[PDB]
């Protein structure tokens, strides 16, 4: 089973996660194996049946993912009114703060490899028919071997292709901001911004702009400028992710083949 009994969990750090969540780090006892470092996300006491239902579906979809660039579910705690999601521990945490704290320490090739990994995770996810809706370097986690994994499936929904939510402005496609239409193509817009963050080593997107300036400038056709050191094909790929017409944006499959080509024959 994936249900974990509470005494198997050792907790050493607990942090607020917005309004009614917390995130913990610690270790998990695993029968006949060394203790496994884990991250945990949980609902705090007082949650509604609805939050419980959404939380447990998030756990349920995550549990079906099996890919090198998708965070692994270790298991769940659901008994006795607890609701925690236990995932593999990622030594180097969030990608944006990781690069920010190691500024200039990687080669462009290593940074492209990181991006290709995020791209592979998103291709896996979109092929299954999920839209993420919250893709950002803050939600990409880094392991000890610099492997990037897509995380945080709380806003993830299945498509039929679009989806309406009955938002993080700097990473969201304008059609999703404006009309709440989320698609694999709006995740592709978000991926472009991630590409930008990575090449800028965790610089804040549109750092010179207020939120309302972001919305109006982007619809007027403003695009993030290439970060220093960014290869021309990489910038072009970003710009393509940011087409005004969602149908003109590359699909993740194409994004991955483009990155693979630049890893194989560097420009």
UniProtKB/Swiss-Prot annotation:
Domain Protein kinase: residue ranges: 9-263
Residues given in the record as ATP binding sites: 15-23, 41
Mod. after translation: Phosphorylated. Phosphorylation is stimulated upon binding of its ligands including EFNA2, EFNA3 and EFNA5. Autophosphorylation on Tyr-206 modulates tyrosine kinase activity.
Highest taxon of the lineage: Eukaryota
Family, as annotated: Belongs to the protein kinase superfamily. Tyr protein kinase family. Ephrin receptor subfamily.
Subunit structure: Heterotetramer upon binding of the ligand. The heterotetramer is composed of an ephrin dimer and a receptor dimer. Oligomerization is probably required to induce biological responses. May also form heterodimers with other ephrin receptors. Interacts with FYN; possible downstream effector of EPHA8 in regulation of cell adhesion. Interacts with PIK3CG; regulates integrin-mediated cell adhesion to substrate. Interacts with TIAM1; regulates clathrin-mediated endocytosis of EPHA8. Interacts with ANKS1A and ANKS1B; EPHA8 kinase activity-independent but stimulated by EPHA8 ubiquitination.
Function, as annotated: Receptor tyrosine kinase which binds promiscuously GPI-anchored ephrin-A family ligands residing on adjacent cells, leading to contact-dependent bidirectional signaling into neighboring cells. The signaling pathway downstream of the receptor is referred to as forward signaling while the signaling pathway downstream of the ephrin ligand is referred to as reverse signaling. The GPI-anchored ephrin-A EFNA2, EFNA3, and EFNA5 are able to activate EPHA8 through phosphorylation. With EFNA5 may regulate integrin-mediated cell adhesion and migration on fibronectin substrate but also neurite outgrowth.
Designated name of the protein: Ephrin type-A receptor 8
Natural source organism: Homo sapiens
Gene name of the record: EPHA8
